[PDB]
Design a protein around this motif. Structure first.
Motif, short mmCIF file in Angstrom:
data_model
loop_
_atom_site.label_atom_id
_atom_site.label_comp_id
_atom_site.label_asym_id
_atom_site.label_seq_id
_atom_site.Cartn_x
_atom_site.Cartn_y
_atom_site.Cartn_z
N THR A 1 -16.31 12.05 -10.15
CA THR A 1 -15.78 10.70 -10.43
C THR A 1 -14.91 10.29 -9.25
OG1 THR A 1 -15.88 11.12 -12.73
CG2 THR A 1 -14.36 9.35 -12.01
N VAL A 2 -15.14 9.10 -8.68
CA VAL A 2 -14.31 8.51 -7.59
C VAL A 2 -13.71 7.22 -8.14
CG1 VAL A 2 -14.19 7.81 -5.17
CG2 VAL A 2 -15.79 9.59 -5.87
N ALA A 3 -12.48 7.34 -8.61
CA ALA A 3 -11.75 6.23 -9.24
C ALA A 3 -11.07 5.47 -8.11
CB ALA A 3 -10.78 6.74 -10.28
N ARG A 4 -11.61 4.30 -7.74
CA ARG A 4 -11.12 3.59 -6.53
C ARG A 4 -10.39 2.30 -6.91
NH1 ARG A 4 -14.31 1.70 -2.24
NH2 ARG A 4 -14.26 -0.56 -2.52
N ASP A 5 -10.55 1.80 -8.14
CA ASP A 5 -9.97 0.49 -8.48
C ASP A 5 -8.45 0.52 -8.25
OD1 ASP A 5 -12.48 -0.45 -9.18
OD2 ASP A 5 -11.97 -0.76 -11.33
N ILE A 6 -7.93 -0.49 -7.55
CA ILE A 6 -6.47 -0.72 -7.40
C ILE A 6 -6.14 -1.99 -8.18
CG2 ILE A 6 -4.67 -1.24 -5.71
CD1 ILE A 6 -6.42 0.31 -3.64
N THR A 7 -5.08 -1.97 -8.99
CA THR A 7 -4.62 -3.16 -9.74
C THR A 7 -3.57 -3.87 -8.89
OG1 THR A 7 -5.18 -2.16 -11.79
CG2 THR A 7 -3.59 -3.97 -11.90
N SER B 1 -1.25 -0.83 -7.90
CA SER B 1 -1.16 0.46 -8.62
C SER B 1 -2.49 1.18 -8.50
CB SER B 1 -0.73 0.23 -10.06
OG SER B 1 -0.61 1.45 -10.76
N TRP B 2 -2.43 2.46 -8.22
CA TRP B 2 -3.59 3.38 -8.21
C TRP B 2 -3.18 4.68 -8.86
CZ3 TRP B 2 -5.11 7.97 -5.29
CH2 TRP B 2 -6.45 8.31 -5.51
N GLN B 3 -3.84 5.06 -9.95
CA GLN B 3 -3.55 6.35 -10.64
C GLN B 3 -2.05 6.49 -10.94
OE1 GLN B 3 -7.12 6.57 -10.96
NE2 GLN B 3 -6.18 8.52 -11.49
N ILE C 1 -3.02 5.18 3.59
CA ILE C 1 -3.82 5.67 2.43
C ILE C 1 -5.30 5.34 2.65
CG2 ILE C 1 -4.25 5.55 -0.02
CD1 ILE C 1 -1.24 5.03 -0.36
N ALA C 2 -5.61 4.09 2.92
CA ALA C 2 -7.02 3.72 3.03
C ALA C 2 -7.23 2.42 3.79
CB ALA C 2 -7.69 3.62 1.67
N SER C 3 -8.39 2.28 4.43
CA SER C 3 -8.98 1.02 4.95
C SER C 3 -10.24 0.71 4.14
CB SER C 3 -9.34 1.11 6.41
OG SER C 3 -8.18 1.17 7.22
N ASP C 4 -10.35 -0.50 3.60
CA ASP C 4 -11.54 -0.87 2.83
C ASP C 4 -12.11 -2.16 3.38
OD1 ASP C 4 -13.25 -0.77 0.12
OD2 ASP C 4 -12.56 -2.84 0.40
N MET C 5 -13.41 -2.15 3.56
CA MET C 5 -14.22 -3.38 3.77
C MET C 5 -15.15 -3.54 2.56
SD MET C 5 -17.02 -4.16 6.72
CE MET C 5 -15.89 -4.46 8.03
N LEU D 1 -5.95 -3.09 3.89
CA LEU D 1 -5.27 -1.87 4.35
C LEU D 1 -4.35 -1.45 3.22
CD1 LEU D 1 -4.65 0.02 6.76
CD2 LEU D 1 -2.80 -1.55 7.30
N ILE D 2 -4.45 -0.19 2.84
CA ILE D 2 -3.68 0.37 1.71
C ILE D 2 -2.74 1.42 2.27
CG2 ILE D 2 -3.81 1.43 -0.53
CD1 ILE D 2 -7.02 0.15 0.06
N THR D 3 -1.46 1.31 1.96
CA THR D 3 -0.43 2.23 2.47
C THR D 3 0.53 2.64 1.36
OG1 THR D 3 1.22 0.52 3.07
CG2 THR D 3 -0.47 1.04 4.70
C1 LIG Z 1 -14.31 5.27 -1.42
O1 LIG Z 1 -13.22 4.40 -1.74
C2 LIG Z 1 -12.10 5.00 -2.24
C3 LIG Z 1 -12.01 6.31 -2.71
C4 LIG Z 1 -10.78 6.79 -3.26
C5 LIG Z 1 -10.83 8.22 -3.73
C6 LIG Z 1 -10.74 8.36 -5.13
N1 LIG Z 1 -10.84 9.57 -5.68
C7 LIG Z 1 -11.10 10.63 -4.94
C8 LIG Z 1 -11.23 10.58 -3.54
C9 LIG Z 1 -11.58 11.79 -2.83
C10 LIG Z 1 -10.86 12.30 -1.79
C11 LIG Z 1 -11.25 13.42 -1.11
C12 LIG Z 1 -12.43 14.10 -1.44
C13 LIG Z 1 -12.76 15.32 -0.60
C14 LIG Z 1 -12.59 16.57 -1.43
C15 LIG Z 1 -12.93 17.85 -0.65
N2 LIG Z 1 -14.29 17.72 -0.07
C16 LIG Z 1 -14.66 18.92 0.72
C17 LIG Z 1 -14.41 16.51 0.75
C18 LIG Z 1 -14.17 15.27 -0.11
C19 LIG Z 1 -13.18 13.60 -2.48
C20 LIG Z 1 -12.77 12.45 -3.17
C21 LIG Z 1 -11.09 9.34 -2.96
C22 LIG Z 1 -11.19 9.21 -1.48
C23 LIG Z 1 -9.67 5.96 -3.35
C24 LIG Z 1 -9.79 4.68 -2.90
O2 LIG Z 1 -8.75 3.79 -2.98
C25 LIG Z 1 -7.54 4.13 -3.67
C26 LIG Z 1 -10.99 4.20 -2.37
O3 LIG Z 1 -10.97 2.89 -1.96
C27 LIG Z 1 -10.37 2.58 -0.66
#
Ligand SMILES: COc1cc(-c2cncc(-c3ccc(C4CCN(C)CC4)cc3)c2C)cc(OC)c1OC
Ligand SMILES: COc1cc(-c2cncc(-c3ccc(C4CCN(C)CC4)cc3)c2C)cc(OC)c1OC
Ligand SMILES: COc1cc(-c2cncc(-c3ccc(C4CCN(C)CC4)cc3)c2C)cc(OC)c1OC
Length: 283
Positions: free
Chosen positions: A2-8, A25-27, A65-69, A80-82
């Protein structure tokens, strides 16, 4: 997985020509989200390219924290997320806070520390980086009393800067453009101006100056390039050092330091590492 990416997005904390900054807010945790105008896309690209080159990590650099397009129907969304600093910018903070000696020194040494980290090449590491838009709105205040430097949209590795903070060689277009050290020396000039802004807010003998931006008494709001050139290059004005500073050993030392950031000859200015050393010996 699960990759929870939504930011409020919760509240807008800044709006300009650059775009907008939001508290989000994120997580369960606050993040800062800068949403770029199409007008300033290049700043997102430059900061993203830099962080793809070197993942900067320093207590006095705003935490990436992150760059998103994201693709939209008719446009590209650039975020840009910081880290989020709830106290806001140094510019904001100086308006309606005064400082004591310890808090003034801690602010300026933390800025110097972040700047020296940018400026230094580390081998085996990081390229040397010049910021090119250092100013009090690009410094955030942390809860522990140190600051961090923000906005690498104009940074160079080895849009123009805010005109009020431009060094003389930028205003008179004599800057050695092929020479990376030139850009460090432009940051040092701007650092000196920030040092002056902060020092004014340090209380000594029951006296403090009101917050003012550099050159408030000699240029208009949104000064033109010519307005700045006349003050800084032709008349060679520098910010005023009030008499009351000379009763206080800390402000006396800080006045000397800011003068050594403001030489017309860029190569005469102190380096960020020399500024740090000087600040560690004050008080
Ligand atoms: C794509 O987009 C976004 C993703 C996330 C995000 C959410 N959960 C988990 C992750 C994560 C981090 C790191 C790994 C690693 C683990 C070890 N392995 C060897 C390599 C992979 C996996 C998963 C991320 C990066 C947050 C975001 O924003 C807050 C995102 O949007 C910008
Ligand atoms: C983007 O930002 C955030 C991301 C995350 C996050 C979510 N899932 C997985 C991770 C992760 C797990 C494991 C590795 C591995 C890599 C190699 N291996 C040898 C050891 C470690 C790397 C990454 C992270 C870092 C959490 C965050 O905050 C708690 C983030 O910040 C807001
Ligand atoms: C300079 O530049 C960037 C700054 C930031 C950033 C990071 N933390 C906190 C902030 C902030 C929070 C809150 C206030 C106010 C609002 C609440 N209250 C009424 C007073 C305080 C001001 C400012 C910002 C603006 C993020 C950035 O990118 C994501 C920046 O761009 C690189």
């Amino acid at each position: 997985r699960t990759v929870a990416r939504d930011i409020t997005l919760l509240e807008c904390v800044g709006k300009g020509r650059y775009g907008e900054v939001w508290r989000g807010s994120w997580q369960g945790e606050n993040v800062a989200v800068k949403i770029f105008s199409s007008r300033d896309e290049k700043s997102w690209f430059r900061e993203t390219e830099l962080y793809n080159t070197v993942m900067l990590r320093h207590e006095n650099i705003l935490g990436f924290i992150a760059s998103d397009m994201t693709s939209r129907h008719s446009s590209t969304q650039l975020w840009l997320i910081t880290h989020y600093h709830e106290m806001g910018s140094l510019y904001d903070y100086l308006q309606l806070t005064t400082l004591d000696t310890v808090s003034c020194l801690r602010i300026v040494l933390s800025i110097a520390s972040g700047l020296a980290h940018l400026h230094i090449e580390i081998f085996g590491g990081k390229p040397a980086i010049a910021h090119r838009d250092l100013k009090s709105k690009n410094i955030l205040v942390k809860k522990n009393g140190q600051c961090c430097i923000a906005d690498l949209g104009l940074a160079v590795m080895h849009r123009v800067g805010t005109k009020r903070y431009m060094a003389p060689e930028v205003l008179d277009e004599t800057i050695q453009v092929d020479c990376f050290d030139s850009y460090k020396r432009v940051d040092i000039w701007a650092f000196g101006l920030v040092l002056w802004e902060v020092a004014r807010r340090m209380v000594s003998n029951g006296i403090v100056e009101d917050y003012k931006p550099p050159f408030y008494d000699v240029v208009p709001n949104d000064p033109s390039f010519e307005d700045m050139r006349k003050v800084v290059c032709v008349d060679q004005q520098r910010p005023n050092i009030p008499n009351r500073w000379f009763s206080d050993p800390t402000l006396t030392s800080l006045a000397k330091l800011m003068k050594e950031c403001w030489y017309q000859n860029p190569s005469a200015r102190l380096t960020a590492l020399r500024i740090k050393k000087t600040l560690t010996k004050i008080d």
